[PDB]
C-alpha cells in the first residue's frame, strides 16, 4: 500500500452519523450521542437547563454498617483513603472538561454528591454480585432529592482498590457521571433484563466512545488491551459539555500528552512502554503535542478533531474532543501513520518506517530513522508562502508520495517531471541548492505559470528513486 492509502484509511476510521448504519444499528454523531446520553434532561441547574456552570459540594459520609440505604443495601462504610484519593481524581476529570466546580465538605455536612460503600443486600448477607449505582439530579423519592448519591460494592476488589484496579477508577467516574445527569447510552429494553450490545439504540454505545457504556470497545472495533479508561471519553465529553458548558480554562498553555507529559493527570500520562494510555483529549488553547515516542508498537495518530488514534499497541484508544486543536505528534520506534490537520503541525516519525501527512498549513516533517514516506494530496498542503518543510530527507531511503494526483486524474501522465515549467498542469520541477542543502519541489497542480505547490526539503532528492507517483 502507498502512503496515501494509509492516510486515506486513517482519515476514514470510525466514520459516524449522517444516517449511516453500523453493526445493523443507527450511527450517531458525537453531538447526537451527547444528547442521547443526556436524554433524561436532568441537571443540577434544573430540568432542561443546559449550558450553565455549576458549583457542587461532595463528601465521604461516615456511614454506619448496620444502616440501610435508600436502595435497600446495608453493611455500609465510609470510603477509605485510597478510595477518596481516586474519587477526587475522577471528580477532577469531569471538572476538566465542563464548567463544574467541586468542593469537599465535612463528612457530617449536607453535600450534593456523596460516595459510600455497601457490602450486604440484607443484614448479615454479603453481596458478591453487584457493582455500583447512583441517582441522577432531581430524583425525588418520598419528597427528598436522591440526586448525587453514589454507592459501590466494596466486596469487589476493584471498588476497594481503585488505584491499582482500573475498572474501579472507571466505575467512580461512571457513577459520578450519573450523579451529574448522564445516563447509560441506552435503556436496552429489547434485552428484557438480560441485555447485550445487540440491544443498543446506537452503534457507538461502547466503551470506545463512552465510559457510561458497559459494552466492550471491541463491538465497534476498538481494543483497549484489557484496560479501562479512567476519564470521560469522546461522547461523555459531548454529553457533559451539553449539560454544563465546555471548560475554556483547561490546559490553555502548551500541553504535552503521553510521554514527557506536563498535564499533571495520570490518565493523560505515561512513563513506560508497558503503561498504556486511554483518553479523549480536551484542551482549550496553546501549542500541544501528542508525544507517543516511548511506545514500540506500530501506531496511527490522527490530529483531527473527533478522530481516533491507535496508540501504544491499543486500537482506537486515543481521541480528540470536538473543538480541540492539537498541533504536534511524535511517533514511536514502530512503523507509524501520522496525520495532521489544517493547522501548522510538527510531525515526527521517530525510528521505523513511517507515513507522514501534514495536510493544510505550514507543516514541519521529520521522518526520523527508517524508510519514511511524506504524503501530499492537495496544492494547499504546501502553498507557496506557507510551504511545508521536510527536515531530514535521505535520498534512496525516504520517499515523497504524490500518488493521489494521478489516481484522481486517472492518468499516469498527469504528474510528471520536467526541467522547466510551461504552464501545463501536472508538471513537477525539482531544484537543488548544493550550497544550502535544500531541494525545492514545485508542482503546477491548478494549471498556472506559477506553481501552486512548493515543498522545501533539507537534503538531496533523487527523482529516479524517491517518488511514488
Ligand atoms: Ca494546551
Ligand atoms: Ca492547541
Ligand atoms: Ca516510528
Ligand atoms: Ca497541517
Ligand atoms: Ca521513521
Ligand atoms: Ca527516514
Ligand atoms: Ca501542510
Ligand atoms: Zn451506570
Per domain, the residue ranges of the chain are 1-15+248-469, 16-247
305 as an active site residue: the answer is no
- CA gap 124, 226 in Å, rounded: 34
- 370 Cα to the center of ligand 3, angstroms: 8
Kindly identify the ligand whose nearest atom is closest to the C-alpha of 339. Answer: 4
DSSP 66: T
Domain 1-15+248-469 sits in CATH 3.30.70.240? no
Integer Cα distance of 302 and 284 in angstroms: 18
Task: Please indicate if the annotation marks 129 as binding a ligand.
Answer: no
What residues does the ion ligand 5 have nearby, CB within 5 Å? 349, 354, 367-368, 370, 372
**C-alpha closest to that of 400 among 327, 466, 348, 456:** 466
- Separation of CA 267 and ligand 4 centre (Å): 27
The string over 239-252, giving b where at least 16 C-beta atoms fall within 10 Å of a residue's C-beta and e elsewhere, is: bbbbbbbbbeebbe
User: Does the annotation flag 336 for ligand binding?
Assistant: yes
Regarding the domain delimited by 16-247, which CATH topology (the fold level of the hierarchy) does it fall under? Collagenase (Catalytic Domain) (3.40.390)
- Cβ atoms within 10 Å of 395's Cβ, excluding its own: 16
Tally Cβ neighbours within 10 Å of residue 164: 12
Question: Active site residue: 15, 165, 175, 364, which one?
Answer: 175
* CB-based burial label for 50 (10 Å; 0-12, 13-18, 19+): middle
Report how far residue 235's alpha carbon sits from residue 220's, in angstroms, rounded to the nearest whole number. 14
- Solving technique: X-ray
Using alpha carbons, list the distances in angstroms from residue 191 to 186, 214, 358: 11, 14, 46
Name the packing angle between helices 234-244 and 30-37 (round to 10°).
60
Q: How far is the CA of 9 from the centre of ligand 6 (A)?
A: 22
Burial of 91 (0-12, 13-18, 19+ CB in 10 A): buried
Which residue, chain included where needed, has cell 486511554? 278
Q: How many angstroms does the Cα of residue 277 sit away from the middle of ligand 2?
A: 20
Tell me which ligand sits closest to the C-alpha of residue 255.
Answer: 1
Question: Ligand 4: distance of its center to the CA of 289 in Å?
Answer: 13
Which residues lie below 8 Å from residue 54, measured CB to CB, with a gap of 6+?
A: 43, 44, 45, 99, 100, 101, 244
Cell of 364: 514541519
Dist CA 274 CA 289 (whole Å): 20
Q: How many Cα atoms occupy the beta-carbon half-sphere of 176 within 13 Å?
A: 28
User: CA-CA distance, 72 to 153, in Å (whole number)?
Assistant: 13
Measured over the CA atoms of residue 142, residue 146, residue 152 and residue 154, the dihedral's sign is negative
Closest ligand to the CA of 295:
3
Amino acid at each position: 500500500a502507498t502512503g496515501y492509502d494509509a492516510v486515506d484509511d486513517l482519515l476514514h476510521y470510525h466514520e459516524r452519523g449522517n444516517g449511516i448504519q453500523i453493526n445493523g444499528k443507527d450511527s450517531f454523531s458525537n453531538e447526537q450521542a451527547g444528547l442521547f446520553i443526556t436524554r433524561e434532561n436532568q441537571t443540577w441547574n434544573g430540568y432542561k437547563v443546559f449550558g450553565q456552570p455549576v458549583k457542587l459540594t461532595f463528601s465521604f459520609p461516615d456511614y454506619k454498617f448496620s444502616s440501610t440505604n435508600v436502595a435497600g443495601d446495608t453493611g455500609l462504610s465510609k470510603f477509605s483513603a485510597e478510595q477518596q484519593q481516586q474519587a477526587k481524581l475522577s471528580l477532577q476529570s469531569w471538572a476538566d472538561v465542563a464548567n463544574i466546580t467541586f468542593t469537599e465538605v465535612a463528612a457530617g455536612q449536607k453535600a450534593n454528591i456523596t460516595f459510600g460503600n455497601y457490602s450486604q443486600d440484607r443484614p448479615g448477607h454479603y453481596d458478591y454480585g453487584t457493582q455500583a449505582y447512583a441517582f441522577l439530579p432531581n430524583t425525588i423519592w418520598q419528597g427528598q432529592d436522591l440526586g448525587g448519591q453514589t454507592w459501590y460494592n466494596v466486596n469487589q476488589s476493584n471498588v476497594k482498590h481503585p488505584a491499582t484496579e482500573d475498572y474501579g477508577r472507571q466505575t467512580f467516574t461512571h457513577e459520578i457521571g450519573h450523579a451529574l445527569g448522564l445516563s447509560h447510552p441506552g435503556d436496552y429494553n429489547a434485552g428484557e433484563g438480560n441485555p447485550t450490545y445487540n440491544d443498543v439504540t446506537y452503534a457507538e454505545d461502547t466503551r470506545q466512545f463512552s465510559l457510561m457504556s458497559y459494552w466492550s470497545e471491541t463491538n465497534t472495533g476498538g481494543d483497549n488491551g484489557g484496560h479501562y479508561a479512567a476519564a470521560p471519553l469522546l461522547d461523555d465529553i459531548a454529553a457533559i459539555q451539553h449539560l454544563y458548558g465546555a471548560n475554556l480554562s483547561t490546559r490553555t498553555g502548551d500541553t504535552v500528552y503521553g510521554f514527557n507529559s506536563n498535564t499533571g493527570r495520570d490518565f493523560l500520562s505515561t512513563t513506560s512502554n508497558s503503561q498504556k494510555v486511554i483518553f479523549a483529549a480536551w484542551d482549550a488553547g496553546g501549542n500541544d503535542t501528542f508525544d507517543f515516542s516511548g511506545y514500540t508498537a506500530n501506531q496511527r495518530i490522527n490530529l483531527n478533531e473527533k478522530s481516533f488514534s491507535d496508540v501504544g499497541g491499543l486500537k482506537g484508544n486515543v481521541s480528540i474532543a470536538a473543538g480541540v486543536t492539537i498541533e504536534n505528534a511524535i511517533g514511536g520506534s514502530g512503523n507509524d501513520v501520522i496525520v495532521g490537520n489544517a493547522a501548522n503541525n510538527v510531525l515526527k516519525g521517530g525510528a521505523g518506517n513511517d507515513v507522514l501527512f501534514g495536510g493544510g498549513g505550514a507543516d514541519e516533517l521529520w521522518g526520523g530513522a527508517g524508510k519514511d514516506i511524506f504524503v501530499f494530496s492537495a496544492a494547499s498542503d504546501s502553498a507557496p508562502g506557507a510551504s511545508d518543510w521536510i527536515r531530514d530527507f535521505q535520498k534512496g531511503i525516504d520517499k515523497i508520495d504524490l500518488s493521489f494526483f494521478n489516481k484522481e486524474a486517472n492518468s499516469s501522465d498527469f504528474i510528471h517531471f520536467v526541467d522547466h515549467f510551461s504552464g501545463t498542469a501536472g508538471e513537477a520541477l525539482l531544484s537543488y541548492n548544493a550550497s544550502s542543502n535544500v531541494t525545492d519541489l514545485s508542482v503546477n497542480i491548478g494549471g498556472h505559470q506559477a506553481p501552486d505547490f512548493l515543498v522545501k526539503i533539507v537534503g538531496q532528492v533523487d527523482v529516479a528513486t524517491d517518488f511514488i507517483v
